[PDB]
């Protein structure tokens, strides 16, 4: 079996980090359980690479994940304090709490899109076997 989930993620400056966790029985992997850190572009790279593969001409590659956008929430958070002085402590806390809820919503949607893409790949009997997909899953220089 090939089981992939995204346990955790980080949003920073303008960059988003996903943790891609793999559980597998397959002999082809060096280890049964491992985790790596990947960025949205890495997901895009995999999709494009699968598309390029001559052998997969007759298969439909799963659509790439949507690029994550945290711009509204990040922009608001910077502004929030920012004007910490202007407002009361309860006002500040409630606002910070609100903006956090927003981050979480964006997180839930983007995490799902990235995870679903990987899960579709593992579903495919041919695609799961792909060498590039494997490297994406467990290559860890650090």
């Amino acid at each position: 079996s090939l089981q992939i989930d995204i346990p955790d993620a980080l949003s920073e400056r303008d960059k988003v980090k996903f943790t891609v966790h793999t559980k597998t029985t397959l002999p082809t992997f060096q280890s049964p359980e491992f985790s790596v850190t990947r960025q949205h572009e890495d997901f895009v790279w995999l999709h494009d690479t699968l598309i390029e593969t001559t052998d997969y001409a007759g298969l439909i590659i799963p659509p790439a994940p949507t690029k994550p956008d945290f711009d509204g929430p990040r922009e608001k958070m910077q502004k929030l304090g920012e004007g910490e002085g202007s407002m009361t402590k309860e006002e500040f806390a409630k606002m910070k709490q609100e903006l956090e809820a927003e981050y979480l919503a964006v997180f839930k949607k983007t995490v799902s899109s990235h995870e679903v893409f990987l899960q579709r790949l593992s579903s495919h009997p041919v695609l799961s076997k792909d060498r590039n997909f494997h490297v994406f899953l467990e290559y860890d220089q650090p």
């Binding site: 346990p7 993620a9 956090e100 997180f107 839930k108």
Partner: peptide, 22 residues
């Protein structure tokens, strides 16, 4: 502005977001 760290809930555990130094 701070980084935000997301933890997917260990179901049925709720998802969490935490403010990270940056």
């Amino acid at each position: 502005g701070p980084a935000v760290q997301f933890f997917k809930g260990k179901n049925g555990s709720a998802d969490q977001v935490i403010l990270v130094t940056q």
